Write a protein that binds this ligand. Structure first.
Ligand SMILES: CC[C@@H](C)c1nccs1
Length: 157
């Protein structure tokens, strides 16, 4: 079972748990890049009453650093915000709770805006079909093949 966060049938409860950064794509590649700060490796989701705790790490030349953020429930169902290098809101366009998770986020800081999508898996790697499916969704959001980065095997600390 597939579900949207927007969807009337979404069980947030099941987003809970261990997740993995498999692919990131941005509108602004630099964010996704080597010393970029949207370059985050999801570690786990702890679902809360109205919030979500996301613990991730960042990696500057193979050394990792742990970071936890609290995204909260905005008024719009399935959507949340979190304050990070400006103001961010995100949704989960697609998930199957047990294997993959796809996100869509909107960073808006100082009048400047950028789009970021990610493919997260329950395991460090997902199939080429998913990556591909994840790849056609980004194209429909205006992000090109040169803007998608597969972190599937660098996602390990
Ligand atoms: C900053 C929030 C981005 C990176 C995401 N984390 C997991 C769901 S969306």
């Amino acid at each position: 079972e597939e579900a949207s966060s927007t969807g009337r049938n979404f069980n947030v409860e099941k987003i809970n748990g261990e997740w993995h950064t498999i692919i990131l794509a941005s509108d602004k590649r630099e964010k996704i890049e080597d010393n970029g700060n949207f370059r985050l490796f999801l570690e786990q989701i702890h679902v809360l009453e109205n919030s979500l705790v996301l613990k991730f790490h960042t990696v500057r030349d193979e050394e990792c650093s742990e970071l936890s953020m609290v995204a909260d429930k905005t008024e719009k169902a399935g959507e949340y915000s979190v304050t990070y290098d400006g103001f961010n809101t995100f949704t989960i366009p697609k998930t199957d709770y047990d294997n993959f998770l796809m996100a869509h986020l909107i960073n808006e800081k100082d009048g400047e805006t950028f789009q970021l999508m990610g493919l997260y898996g329950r395991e460090p790697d997902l199939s080429s079909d998913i990556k591909e499916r994840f790849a056609q969704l980004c194209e429909e959001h205006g992000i090109l093949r040169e803007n998608i980065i597969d972190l599937s095997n660098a996602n390990r600390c």
